[PDB]
Amino acid sequence: ERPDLAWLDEVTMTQLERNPYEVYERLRAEAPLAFVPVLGSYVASTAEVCREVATSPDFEAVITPAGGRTFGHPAIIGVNGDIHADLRSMVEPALQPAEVDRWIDDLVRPIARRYLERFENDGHAELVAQYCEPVSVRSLGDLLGLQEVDSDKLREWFAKLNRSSTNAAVDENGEFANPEGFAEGDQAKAEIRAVVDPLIDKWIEHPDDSAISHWLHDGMPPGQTRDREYIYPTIYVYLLGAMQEPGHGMASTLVGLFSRPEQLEEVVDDPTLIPRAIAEGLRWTSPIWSATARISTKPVTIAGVDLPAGTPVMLSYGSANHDTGKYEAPSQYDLHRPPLPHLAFGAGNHACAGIYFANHVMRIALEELFEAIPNLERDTREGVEFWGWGFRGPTSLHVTWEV
Numbered sequence: 001e002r003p004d005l006a007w008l009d010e011v012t013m014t015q016l017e018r019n020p021y022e023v024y025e026r027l028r029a030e031a032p033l034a035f036v037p038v039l040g041s042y043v044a045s046t047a048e049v050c051r052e053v054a055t056s057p058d059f060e061a062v063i064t065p066a067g068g069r070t071f072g073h074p075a076i077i078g079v080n081g082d083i084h085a086d087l088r089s090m091v092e093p094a095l096q097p098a099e100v101d102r103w104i105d106d107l108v109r110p111i112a113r114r115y116l117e118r119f120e121n122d123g124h125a126e127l128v129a130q131y132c133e134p135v136s137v138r139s140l141g142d143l144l145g146l147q148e149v150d151s152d153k154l155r156e157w158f159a160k161l162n163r164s165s166t167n168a169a170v171d172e173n174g175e176f177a178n179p180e181g182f183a184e185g186d187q188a189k190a191e192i193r194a195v196v197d198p199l200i201d202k203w204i205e206h207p208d209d210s211a212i213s214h215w216l217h218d219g220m221p222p223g224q225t226r227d228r229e230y231i232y233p234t235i236y237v238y239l240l241g242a243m244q245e246p247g248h249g250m251a252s253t254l255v256g257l258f259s260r261p262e263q264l265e266e267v268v269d270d271p272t273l274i275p276r277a278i279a280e281g282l283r284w285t286s287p288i289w290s291a292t293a294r295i296s297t298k299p300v301t302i303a304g305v306d307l308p309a310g311t312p313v314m315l316s317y318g319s320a321n322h323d324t325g326k327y328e329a330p331s332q333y334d335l336h337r338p339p340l341p342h343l344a345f346g347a348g349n350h351a352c353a354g355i356y357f358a359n360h361v362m363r364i365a366l367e368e369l370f371e372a373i374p375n376l377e378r379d380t381r382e383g384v385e386f387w388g389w390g391f392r393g394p395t396s397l398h399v400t401w402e403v
């Protein structure tokens with residue numbers, strides 16, 4: 001409907017999944033708030049608009065259409081008011097910085113060592129499948145109480161939930177263009193229920209120190225637990241992004257460092273720079289790229305667009321983190337960029353609840369990797385492909401080292 005943006009009618013979902021940065025570079029210049037037809041939604045592409053929408057008192061959280069189809073209600077990302085406050089109070093205890101500092105090292109470092117010892121003498125590895133994803137899912141899985149669920153299964157689940165919740169394409173009538181793409185999300189949820197329902201049965205009667213046991217029991221009257229249907233959508237939210245993103249963030253950081261070999265050497269020589277390297281990695285390729293949204297609660301004007309009440313806006317934080325109003329040459333990974341604010345963890349009342357935990361998981365994993373394989377090199381015979389619009393990360397990362 002906006003005439004000068006008629007080129008957006010020809011943008012495809014495949015194009016956005018393969019590489020969204022060219023389209024979003026145009027959006028940031030032409031229309032920082034723009035209706036993208038294949039997504040069926042307004043999209044915020046600049047840091048200023050994303051931050052305004054994410055923190056505005058005239059917006060509240062809304063789940064994306066494909067996210068709602070995947071997760072249902074009450075997904076912590078899609079609710080507000082009293083339910084959101086309860087769900088935040090439910091998840092926040094184990095994520096509190098003082099609590100994380102008590103046990104994060106004894107959690108992650110032995111896991112990292114376990115996966116490293118499977119390949120650290122091979123001279124070759126595919127780090128996404130062999131290290132970054134396993135460490136990410138095993139760390140969170142143990143925290144949650146899913147010790148018995150193999151890392152391969154956790155990885156499969158987040159992949160299916162990723163594809164289902166980002167199955168956003170709509171057709172000429174605004175209907176989902178690929179409804180069969182939700183089937184694997186439904187199958188993952190069915191498998192998750194089969195594994196987790198017996199665990200919940202047990203935790204209700206025999207609480208333990210697992211996070212999900214605490215979700216059932218914390219803050220409840222004596223002998224009562226939160227209904228499992230009330231907490232399952234947030235379990236699913238964890239089994240997608242909480243499981244996937246630390247691995248994506250570590251992997252993207254490594255790809256970025258490999259692209260700047262002098263900076264890789266600096267970080268290997270001085271591991272106190274790992275946190276800075278990760279923060280630049282998250283800006284450079286944001287793991288949660290465009291997966292959340294807000295909805296206006298009253299008429300509002302944003303970036304010159306008059307929006308009615310009830311208008312959803314997707315928050316494309318991954319684009320905002322390449323805003324050239326803020327960053328010079330943002331498509332280049334640069335460890336020595338000044339430590340400016342970034343939006344890879346979102347903003348506002350629905351900002352990431354697990355930042356401190358996530359940053360430590362990624363730090364410890366990279367510390368142990370560089371200690372075990374100080375002469376790590378990228379295998380330049382193999383290409384690194386990034387994939388994803390909603391969630392983005394490298395699909396593989398082949399490396400080599402002299403043994």
Ligand code: HEM
Pocket residue numbers: 054076077078088091095140241242243245246249282286287288292293315317343344345346347348349350351352353354355357358359
């Ligand atoms: C590098 C890793 C991670 C990144 C980049 C990331 C990023 C994000 C982003 C962008 C959001 C949406 C915020 C918004 O809509 O403004 C979010 C939400 C959330 N994340 Fe993180 N996340 C990461 C890891 C984790 C982990 C490991 C956990 C749990 C242990 C977690 C828990 C949550 C929760 C509960 C929410 C929903 C907050 C709410 O809607 O109130 N995240 N995260």
Ligand SMILES: COc1cccc(CO)c1O
Pocket residue numbers: 067077165236237238239240241242288291292
């Ligand atoms: C913590 O996990 C998530 C954070 C933000 C969005 C989603 C799914 O859309 C997630 O699963």
